[PDB]
Enzyme design. Structure first.
Site, short mmCIF file in Angstrom:
data_model
loop_
_atom_site.label_atom_id
_atom_site.label_comp_id
_atom_site.label_asym_id
_atom_site.label_seq_id
_atom_site.Cartn_x
_atom_site.Cartn_y
_atom_site.Cartn_z
N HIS A 280 9.46 -3.54 7.73
CA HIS A 280 8.19 -3.46 8.46
C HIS A 280 7.37 -4.73 8.43
CE1 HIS A 280 5.46 -3.39 5.03
NE2 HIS A 280 6.48 -2.83 4.40
N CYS A 298 10.24 -2.24 -0.13
CA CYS A 298 10.34 -2.49 1.30
C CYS A 298 10.75 -3.93 1.60
CB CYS A 298 9.02 -2.18 2.02
SG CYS A 298 8.65 -0.40 2.07
#
EC number: 2.3.2.-
Length: 351
Positions: A280, A298
């Protein structure tokens, strides 16, 4: 001269007649003059007699917990025969509905497993496997493996070959899936495998490199998980994608206000693990991306790179993470299927 003979697929008096198959009646030494089947308050059941008059069959779904009665007469040159049969179909203790992924008519990446998720725990895994018919073209060997008590997966040894058609017929209606749990319905899906797309995140370089059919088409500096909350190494299957999503650690076991909790809105998010690893947009860490790990696990990348990844990577594409300080992503994560060695996957765990 011969007396006509009737052969029904049920016997008069039977109980627990399963409702996965049609009910039929056949004439020999003659032809069928009348066939009717009726439930236990007279509603006709609906069926069709073959053109030659020899074979009749129900044409619609039959019900759980019904008492049906079947009247048939056969006429021949040498006489008539008539029978009346009454039988009772399975009455489940519970029903379970299957849900299949990926979507019907979808084009998916070369890592996409067939997923059948039941909304209850399956006591007879083997009966479930047996009810699921998978067709591949070109045909390839695959096998079932259970991620948990409700969800079974099927896949090949290796990543799918681009252009493979995959068909999945979950024929669980009328099937006893154990301890009186029966299928609520059948389901079907058909998908196709698309291009080969494999993105590799190397912790030695902090770059996520996207390869389409063996060629580099994008190189994304990235910031993965910090040493205390590292990104696991291994093969991740791409799932869902989000223009934006609120990432809430409590979704993944971890209270927002604990030391590793978080609740943050992010853009251009592609999910790659059920444990909550996403690729992301991370404007806040563009500085660190290419150099140091700062995340909860992440794959932080630039805004243009996360949006590129949203647009160009699809469900079933692959991300491989290598050389981190973390462990290996669990086989049973939900998107970690390829980390289980083939010999173990193939042996299965239907017990």
């Amino acid at each position: 001269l011969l007396v006509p003979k009737l052969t029904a697929s049920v016997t008069d008096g039977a109980v627990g007649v399963t409702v996965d198959a049609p009910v039929s009646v056949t004439a020999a030494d003659g032809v069928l003059a009348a066939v009717t089947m009726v439930n236990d308050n007279g509603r006709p059941v609906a069926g069709r007699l073959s053109p030659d008059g020899l074979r009749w069959s129900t044409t619609e779904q039959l019900g759980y917990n019904r008492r049906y009665t079947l009247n048939a007469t056969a006429l021949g040159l040498g006489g008539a025969a008539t029978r009346q049969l009454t039988f009772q179909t399975s009455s489940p203790a519970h029903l379970t509905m299957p849900y299949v992924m990926p979507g019907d008519g979808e084009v998916v990446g070369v890592g996409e497993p067939v997923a059948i998720r039941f909304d209850e725990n399956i006591a007879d895994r083997g009966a479930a496997e047996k009810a699921i018919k998978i067709t591949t073209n070109p045909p390839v060997e695959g096998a079932f493996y259970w991620l948990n008590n409700r969800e079974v997966r099927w896949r090949p040894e290796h990543f799918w070959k681009p252009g493979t058609a995959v068909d999945v017929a979950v024929n669980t209606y009328g099937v006893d899936l154990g301890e009186g749990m029966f299928g609520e319905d059948n389901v079907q899906t058909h998908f196709t495998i698309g291009d080969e797309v494999i993105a590799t995140a190397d912790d030695n370089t902090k770059i996520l490199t996207v390869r389409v059919n063996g060629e580099v088409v994008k190189s994304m500096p990235t910031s993965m998980g910090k040493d205390s909350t590292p990104t696991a190494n291994g093969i991740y299957i791409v799932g869902s994608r989000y223009k934006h999503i609120i990432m809430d650690s409590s979704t993944y076991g971890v209270p927002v206000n604990s030391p590793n909790g978080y609740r943050t809105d992010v853009d251009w998010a592609t999910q790659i693990s059920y444990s909550g690893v996403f690729v992301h947009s991370a404007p806040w860490s563009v500085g660190a991306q290419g150099h140091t790990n700062t995340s909860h696990g992440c794959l932080n990348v630039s805004p243009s790179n996360a949006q590129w990844f949203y647009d160009h990577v699809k469900r079933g594409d692959i991300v491989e993470v290598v050389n981190t300080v973390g462990g290996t992503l669990p086989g049973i994560d939900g998107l970690g299927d390829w980390n289980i060695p083939w010999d173990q996957w193939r042996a299965g765990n239907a017990k």
